[PDB]
Amino acid sequence: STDNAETGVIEANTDTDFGELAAPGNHTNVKFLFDRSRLLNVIKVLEKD
Amino acid sequence: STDNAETGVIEANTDTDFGELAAPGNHTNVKFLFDRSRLLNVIKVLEKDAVFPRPFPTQEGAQQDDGYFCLLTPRPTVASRPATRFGLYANPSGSGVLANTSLDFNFYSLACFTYFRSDLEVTVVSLEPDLEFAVGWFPSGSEYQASSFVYDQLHVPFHFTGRTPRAFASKGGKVSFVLPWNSVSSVLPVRWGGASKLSSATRGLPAHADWGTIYAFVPRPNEKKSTAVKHVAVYIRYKNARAWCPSMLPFRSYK
Amino acid sequence: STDNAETGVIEANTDTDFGELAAPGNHTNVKFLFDRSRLLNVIKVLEKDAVFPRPFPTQEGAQQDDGYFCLLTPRPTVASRPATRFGLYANPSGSGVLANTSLDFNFYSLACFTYFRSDLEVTVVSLEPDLEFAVGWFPSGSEYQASSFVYDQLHVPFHFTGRTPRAFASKGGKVSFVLPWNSVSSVLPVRWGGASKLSSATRGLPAHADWGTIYAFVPRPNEKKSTAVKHVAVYIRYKNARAWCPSMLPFRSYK
Amino acid sequence: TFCGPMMARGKFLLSYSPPNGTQPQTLSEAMQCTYSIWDIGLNSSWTFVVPYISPSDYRETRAITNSVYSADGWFSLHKLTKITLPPDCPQSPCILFFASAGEDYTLRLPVDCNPSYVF
Amino acid sequence: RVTTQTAGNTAINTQSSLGVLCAYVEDPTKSDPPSSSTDQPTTTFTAIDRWYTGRLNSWTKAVKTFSFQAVPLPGAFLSRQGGLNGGAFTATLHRHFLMKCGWQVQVQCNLTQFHQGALLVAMVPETTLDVKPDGKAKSLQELNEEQWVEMSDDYRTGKNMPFQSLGTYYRPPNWTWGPNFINPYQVTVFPHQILNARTSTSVDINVPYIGETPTQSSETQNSWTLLVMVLVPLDYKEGATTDPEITFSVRPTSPYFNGLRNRYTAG
Amino acid sequence: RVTTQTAGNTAINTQSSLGVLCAYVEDPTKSDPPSSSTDQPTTTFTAIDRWYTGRLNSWTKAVKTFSFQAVPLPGAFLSRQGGLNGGAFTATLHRHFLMKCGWQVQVQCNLTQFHQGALLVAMVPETTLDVKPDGKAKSLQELNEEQWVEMSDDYRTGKNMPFQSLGTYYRPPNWTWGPNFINPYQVTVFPHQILNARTSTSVDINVPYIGETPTQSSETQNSWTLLVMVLVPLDYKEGATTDPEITFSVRPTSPYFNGLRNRYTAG
Incomplete structure (x- = not known):
């Protein structure tokens, strides 16, 4: 469709050209994604100052 | 009494011919029957980063690590991959490599429908005395990450860390947790007749009919490998199961 | 003035540029223009039962009676049959048989559309002095009845009687009557591009685009045949004519 | 988006072919499937939306066996006409490809990463 | 026991009939468009809303x-x-x-x-x-x-x-062993009718759409299979009649189509 | 001067356009089923409600x-x-x-x-x-x-x-002589548009159904013919550009069909 991407801010499915508006079905949320353990480093154990 | 069974739909106690209408006294419910644990498979325990088996056919002289990993599905499987024909090695010593196989005898003894769906609840039990281990799992359609990194000149396999769940159990402990139905297919086909690819496909072999994959490993560096093998047991349960259409039952010989 | 004729639909007197709007003062109406007589064709007069011409191609040595009968249509015709290419024998004496042809010059001089429809009003005029005759006509898709019967040892052609109209005119008289639009096709195609048959057809040759057929005969028995030939003239008119889409006009040479 | 001399002209055709036994090649084949025609003019940018059709509600993100659950056909670009380069404009314009996600995109299951970029 | 069903430009007659078996649900005709795609689908029309006929081997x-x-x-x-x-x-x-x-x-x-x-x-x-x-x-x-x-x-x-x-x-x-055994003694579980030689001549069934997805690939789906089996072997007095014949008729109902393209080809 | 028409699963774009010529009557889309037959007809559907494209010789x-x-x-x-x-x-x-x-x-x-x-x-x-x-x-x-x-x-x-x-x-x-002469000087009578080299690039027309019967045979009808003619011979400075190309697009509207049968064959 008509647009001008050189300007940067482009407009915004199949309802625009031919539509389909598949219903929603939030696993990408920032708060949710980053809450899970992961290894960081392995270190020795001291036995004196 | 008068009836016509050729039509199929027959009518429907002793009150009709001679009655007795014994009062009721729901143990056959689908939701209730399928909620109880049962063994699935027995697998080895890793001690280093492994190489996943290659897809069939596997030519002679191919280097890999076999005997580990295991699918989560009642349908027959071979070499940790989906299969159709169940088989076993009843013959004496031979040659080559023996392929691990599995199947849910109890499930198929009453699998009298076509389509099924339920949540899965996994647990793990050790066999050798005073053994320490851990478990890892990933969804369907994913892949197992290989290779290892060096920390203070110790080779730690990459599978120590990941976004997928991990479980660490104390010395001589046990593990348990419940996973969600995550396959793309809406329901699980007990028996199928389609094809997964446009060409070179095998009839009746489903693609992503499972719950995931599981493996076991020891929390030690690769620089402390041992010799004696170790084993682990697996059990599964079904939650809120449902069935969607009638079917047949396994044949019993008349010998 | 400003305009854009490339678009096709141009706008629309002297009041626009410099006006004059001369008051009106409908002689071009389609219904009015086409209501007037005009000659169509000249035909011989029968004196006995005749044999209708055979369909083309006609092989050498075929017995028939040619020169009589005539269609009622403006489109070109040959040998009393529909045709596409108009032709004439401008050459001197030759061989074989010469095919009578006809066409409506006046109609085609202003035939500037494709589809047409109207009622037809026929009349007949004699040429030879003190001549007695009669006329007969039948609809489109019908056939001319041949053979003759004997009455008191006189052979009377069958065409004396029939369910179709007949006209008897006094000595040195004239005939006239109006016929209805009777062809199966809804309208008359001035120019056509289809085919009438699934196979072996000729492109652009319509099937039943006409009003009927006409012939002339003398009320005498076959036992009184003469030698000298006779001729008759025909005129036609259109009533409540209508046109349905634009078209072109005949080309005029620049010589 | 187009990048070339202003006073040039041409016409392009965009196509999208669902899965088949063989990848369509000829323009005649391409025309029957879903398609559209792009005309060079004042605006040099055009957006083509790929419809989502599949036998399952969700689809896998990485393909190994190329099963119907991962692959979803092909996309192609065909030159309908011949580009007319105006005089004194040297030759050979260029086209830039821009891709993104639709307004109804979605992702479901997290997984582990690949640390290959560190080597 | 005498009825006829008309569809499209074709019809079928039954000199004997017990009825129509409606399978799992009442009114199998009802249906809705799939949900695993967006492109507008193609629906039924007169050209395809009709019966078809074929032949089987003799008995x-x-x-x-x-x-x-x-x-x-x-x-x-x-x-x-x-x-x-x-x-x-x-x-x-x-x-x-x-x-x-x-x-x-x-x-x-x-x-x-x-x-x-x-x-x-x-x-x-x-x-x-x-x-x-x-x-x-x-x-x-x-x-x-x-x-x-x-x-x-x-x-x-x-x-x-x-x-x-x-x-x-x-x-x-x-x-x-495999999960696609055949158990002859239990085939009656699926919708069926007994075509006895002394009670009737024609049998009929109505089934809805099933599958592990809202829609299935149109080049490989094999959801329903028509099966005919012999229970009592045929027998008759010699010289009376020889080897009857069999026929069948099919008709789709409320179809949907998606994913237009050129003619399918393999390789 | 910038517009696009969408039909079925295909669309067409026009960087320049004057409009659409509607031919004899307004709203050519309106139509009714024929009257010279009784069997129910087949009507439009998405599979055929779309455009088609082709090519012509060069200039x-x-x-x-x-x-x-x-x-x-x-x-x-x-x-x-x-x-x-x-x-x-x-x-x-x-x-x-x-x-x-x-x-x-x-x-x-x-x-x-x-x-x-x-x-x-x-x-x-x-x-x-x-x-x-x-x-x-x-x-x-x-x-x-x-x-x-x-x-x-x-x-x-x-x-x-x-x-x-x-x-x-x-x-x-x-x-x-014959009733199908061609008169070049009067071709503009039929609906048309001038495709000049300095004003526009694309032209378009809309026409209704015509014929001497309410319906015509589907294997021989030739009602409408597309004609392209050259008025001013092409000319340009040497070395600039060579021999432009031509294309066209078609789309039927509100069709009807009758008389089903097997595939047409001749002999």
Whole structure:
């Protein structure tokens, strides 16, 4: 469709050209994604100052 | 009494011919029957980063690590991959490599429908005395990450860390947790007749009919490998199961 | 003035540029223009039962009676049959048989559309002095009845009687009557591009685009045949004519 | 988006072919499937939306066996006409490809990463 | 016992009839468009809203108990088995990727009162009998020599369905079971009717759409399979009549299509 | 001057456009089923509610004034001329006897400001230019050698259209005229648009259904013919650009079909 991407801010499915508006079905949320353990480093154990 | 069974739909106690209408006294419910644990498979325990088996056919002289990993599905499987024909090695010593196989005898003894769906609840039990281990799992359609990194000149396999769940159990402990139905297919086909690819496909072999994959490993560096093998047991349960259409039952010989 | 004729639909007197709007003062109406007589064709007069011409191609040595009968249509015709290419024998004496042809010059001089429809009003005029005759006509898709019967040892052609109209005119008289639009096709195609048959057809040759057929005969028995030939003239008119889409006009040479 | 001399002209055709036994090649084949025609003019940018059709509600993100659950056909670009380069404009314009996600995109299951970029 | 069903420009007559079996749910005709795609679908029209007809092998005394024949759907249309020719339906099928439809079939025979025997017809879902054990569909020429399929322990155990060869790396196991066995004694579970020689001549069933996804690929789906099996072997007095014949009719219901493209080709 | 028309699963874009010519009546889309038959007809559906595209010969300086090319409709679909492939529309056409539909076409060219010339496109009704004088349709191979048809006195007079040989019984007349002459100076009467090299690039027309009967045979009708003729011969400075190209698009509207049968065959 008509647009001008050189300007940067482009407009915004199949309802625009031919539509389909598949219903929603939030696993990408920032708060949710980053809450899970992961290894960081392995270190020795001291036995004196 | 008068009836016509050729039509199929027959009518429907002793009150009709001679009655007795014994009062009721729901143990056959689908939701209730399928909620109880049962063994699935027995697998080895890793001690280093492994190489996943290659897809069939596997030519002679191919280097890999076999005997580990295991699918989560009642349908027959071979070499940790989906299969159709169940088989076993009843013959004496031979040659080559023996392929691990599995199947849910109890499930198929009453699998009298076509389509099924339920949540899965996994647990793990050790066999050798005073053994320490851990478990890892990933969804369907994913892949197992290989290779290892060096920390203070110790080779730690990459599978120590990941976004997928991990479980660490104390010395001589046990593990348990419940996973969600995550396959793309809406329901699980007990028996199928389609094809997964446009060409070179095998009839009746489903693609992503499972719950995931599981493996076991020891929390030690690769620089402390041992010799004696170790084993682990697996059990599964079904939650809120449902069935969607009638079917047949396994044949019993008349010998 | 400003305009854009490339678009096709141009706008629309002297009041626009410099006006004059001369008051009106409908002689071009389609219904009015086409209501007037005009000659169509000249035909011989029968004196006995005749044999209708055979369909083309006609092989050498075929017995028939040619020169009589005539269609009622403006489109070109040959040998009393529909045709596409108009032709004439401008050459001197030759061989074989010469095919009578006809066409409506006046109609085609202003035939500037494709589809047409109207009622037809026929009349007949004699040429030879003190001549007695009669006329007969039948609809489109019908056939001319041949053979003759004997009455008191006189052979009377069958065409004396029939369910179709007949006209008897006094000595040195004239005939006239109006016929209805009777062809199966809804309208008359001035120019056509289809085919009438699934196979072996000729492109652009319509099937039943006409009003009927006409012939002339003398009320005498076959036992009184003469030698000298006779001729008759025909005129036609259109009533409540209508046109349905634009078209072109005949080309005029620049010589 | 187009990048070339202003006073040039041409016409392009965009196509999208669902899965088949063989990848369509000829323009005649391409025309029957879903398609559209792009005309060079004042605006040099055009957006083509790929419809989502599949036998399952969700689809896998990485393909190994190329099963119907991962692959979803092909996309192609065909030159309908011949580009007319105006005089004194040297030759050979260029086209830039821009891709993104639709307004109804979605992702479901997290997984582990690949640390290959560190080597 | 006398009724006729009219559809499109074709009709079917029944001198005898018990009714129509409606399968799992009442009014199988009702349906809705799928949900795993967005492009607008193609729906029913008069060209395809009509019946189709075909032929089967004859019935001979030599046939023994439990022998059977199968006709996959819609694969029968594509394979042109038994002379069935879908015409417009086949043409539309070859030009689409996704399909969803029901089915409605009827089978007739010409048994007379001077014959004894029985036949059983049922719509077994999600089965594979057409394919040879090698893993290739049974060809039309191969389907002629053997008129009826012989029941055997292999089929009963489901031990000979298509499989994948492991390769030289492994050792060949001993195959003994599979999830697509056939149990003759329990075939009546699926919707069916008994085509006895002394009660009626034509039987009919109505089934809805099923599948593990809202829509299935239009070039490989094999949801429903038509199965005919012999219970009581045919027998009659010599010299009376020889080897009756069989026929069947099909008609789709409320179909949907998606994913237009050129004609399907392989390679 | 920038607009796009969307139909089915396909769309067309126009960087320049004056509008759409609506031909004889407003809203050509409106229509009603025929009246010369009773069997229920087949109507439009998504599979056929879309555009189609094809190609024509190139334009070269050697071409002189009034030369032309013609594309019969719907005979172009059947003949597969210019690479046009109707697909579903052709398949449905070959399986019916009666048809009735409108038309809606657009033609585009790639002329640049550094070229001079003019083109004229019109929808001439009820004409026969495809056929050779012999009385046989022009083959695709024959249509290649001669890229453009040369205007001549014969065509101007309509003296060489198909005819019927009289036979040996008669003598051969001198053919001089026929009702299908071509008059170049008056072609603008039919709906048309001038495709000048300095004003626009794409032209389009909308036409309704016409014919001497409420419905016409689907295997021979030639109601509408697309005609392209050259008014001002092309000319440009040497070395700038060579021989632009031509294309066109078609789309039926509100069709009807009747008389189902098997695939058409001749003999």
